[PDB]
Amino acid sequence: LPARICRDIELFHFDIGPFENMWPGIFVYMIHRSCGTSCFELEKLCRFIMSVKKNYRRVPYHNWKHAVTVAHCMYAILQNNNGLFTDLERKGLLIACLCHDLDHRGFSNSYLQKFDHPLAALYSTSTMEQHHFSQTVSILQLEGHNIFSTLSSSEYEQVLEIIRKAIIATDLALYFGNRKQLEEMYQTGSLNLHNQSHRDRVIGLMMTACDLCSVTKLWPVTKLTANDIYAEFWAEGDEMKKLGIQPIPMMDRDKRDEVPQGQLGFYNAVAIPCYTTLTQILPPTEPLLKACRDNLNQWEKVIR
Numbered sequence: 166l167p168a169r170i171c172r173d174i175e176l177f178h179f180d181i182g183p184f185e186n187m188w189p190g191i192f193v194y195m196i197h198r199s200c201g202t203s204c205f206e207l208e209k210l211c212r213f214i215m216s217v218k219k220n221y222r223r224v225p226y227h228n229w230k231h232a233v234t235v236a237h238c239m240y241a242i243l244q245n246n247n248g249l250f251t252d253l254e255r256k257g258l259l260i261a262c263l264c265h266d267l268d269h270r271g272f273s274n275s276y277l278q279k280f281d282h283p284l285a286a287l288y289s290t291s292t293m294e295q296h297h298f299s300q301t302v303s304i305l306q307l308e309g310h311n312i313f314s315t316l317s318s319s320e321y322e323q324v325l326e327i328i329r330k331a332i333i334a335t336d337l338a339l340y341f342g343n344r345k346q347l348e349e350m351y352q353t354g355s356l357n358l359h360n361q362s363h364r365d366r367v368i369g370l371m372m373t374a375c376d377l378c379s380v381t382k383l384w385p386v387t388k389l390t391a392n393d394i395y396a397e398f399w400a401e402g403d404e405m406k407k408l409g410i411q412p413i414p415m416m417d418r419d420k421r422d423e424v425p426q427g428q429l430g431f432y433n434a435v436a437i438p439c440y441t442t443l444t445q446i447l448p449p450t451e452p453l454l455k456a457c458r459d460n461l462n463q464w465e466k467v468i469r
């Protein structure tokens with residue numbers, strides 16, 4: 166509601182600030198603007214939001230702030246591509262973004278597999294992401310939390326499927342193949358948004374874009390966010406060392422001087438191709454790409 170947030174929330178590079186109690190109203194505002202004050206019952210939605218918050222953990226990066234920030238990036242993409250996605254897709258994607266890291270411990274799928282965690286026996290591929298979706302469903306199934314209760318049974322199954330595919334697509338290992346397919350479709354002119362399977366890929370890429378969006382903020386935000394990202398990675402690295410396994414250098418706090426080189430690698434192999442491809446499909450997302458490039462230049466600056 167405050168006037169500065171009113172204006173600035175429309176910017177792709179908005180940062181949601183340090184006042185946690187404001188983040189729910191920020192999410193409600195985004196969801197009402199992206200699909201009527203009259204869709205979700207307000208008391209039901211508020212109850213849902215607080216239970217989601219509660220099942221996020223106090224880890225350095227994959228926390229409740231990240232969830233809302235990823236939702237905000239989705240809001241921004243959707244607001245600047247009016248008319249492409251249906252009411253149902255927009256509601257589903259925003260809720261998917263809010264829920265997409267539920268009950269995250271700060272550890273990757275690879276660590277969970279190497280640790281032999283029970284979640285890895287339950288869900289062999291995209292382990293944390295299948296968990297995040299299971300948590301979403303369990304929250305929806307609590308008395309008073311079914312924010313989709315006015316939908317038909319068919320539309321409910323539809324939106325849950327939208328949410329499921331969107332959360333799964335946040336498994337970055339899936340992004341490389343997805344992005345390759347989308348680039349082949351762009352270049353041959355075969356991409357068709359009326360084709361559900363194509364549409365699903367586009368939405369997947371949007372989920373990657375939102376999930377990575379720390380690299381599309383202004384430099385001071387991007388830089389400070391990277392401290393939280395590496396704080397989790399280095400903790401996992403420590404855990405890897407404790408299982409008897411040399412971690413990759415990105416996770417090795419002893420190789421912390423190579424952070425800039427590591428960022429260069431990531432921007433070159435992941436972030437820039439991600440936002441390049443997104444911009445080709447959805448040209449109004451260009452500010453994400455531009456901000457990404459500016460941050461690549463800042464990292465190159467750090468190296469000199």
Ligand SMILES: COc1cc2ncnc(N3CC[C@@H](Oc4ccc5ccccc5c4)C3)c2cc1OC
Pocket residue numbers: 337376377379380391394415427428430431434435
């Ligand atoms: C802004 O900085 C970020 C932001 C991130 N957000 C989400 N997930 C990340 N990691 C998950 C597993 C890792 O997967 C890679 C795939 C391809 C690579 C190519 C080159 C370098 C690193 C790479 C990491 C990357 C990640 C890493 C980052 O910097 C190193």
Ligand SMILES: [Mg+2]
Pocket residue numbers: 265266293335336
């Ligand atoms: Mg995740």
Ligand SMILES: [Zn+2]
Pocket residue numbers: 227231235265266335376
């Ligand atoms: Zn995430």
